[PDB]
Design a protein around this ligand. Sequence first.
Ligand code: BDD
Ligand code: BDD
Ligand code: BDD
Length: 101
Amino acid sequence: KYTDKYDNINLDEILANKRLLVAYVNCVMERGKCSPEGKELKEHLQDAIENGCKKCTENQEKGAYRVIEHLIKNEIEIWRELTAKYDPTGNWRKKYEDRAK
Ligand SMILES: OCCCCCCCCCCCCBr
Ligand SMILES: OCCCCCCCCCCCCBr
Ligand SMILES: OCCCCCCCCCCCCBr
């Protein structure tokens, strides 16, 4: 089971501040420095894609959808690079895009 120690981080504040959001994106894309939380996310994202969040907490599932919907609607280029890197066979791309729409 993934740790819940970072589960009280306010995702709304991150999504509303481009500088904060880009820091996490560059970390997960393996082109920028990581915060402790960013490193933890980077280290579990591939696994979560392979098993549909089987080890995610309820807060992580809810938070993943919040972040993903925001990217699909407002940061298309970021969404595309993330899904291409972590989900190259497209297990979830159409499913999340359909929900967002
Ligand atoms: O439940 C919250 C734990 C994860 C803490 C990191 C939040 C990062 C959210 C921004 C992700 C941007 C796409 Br890489
Ligand atoms: O259905 C595929 C899920 C895609 C999003 C997975 C988010 C994984 C969150 C990992 C949290 C680790 C603590 Br920082
Ligand atoms: O095709 C699926 C690609 C999934 C990439 C989205 C990663 C965003 C995860 C954010 C984690 C937040 C949980 Br608090």
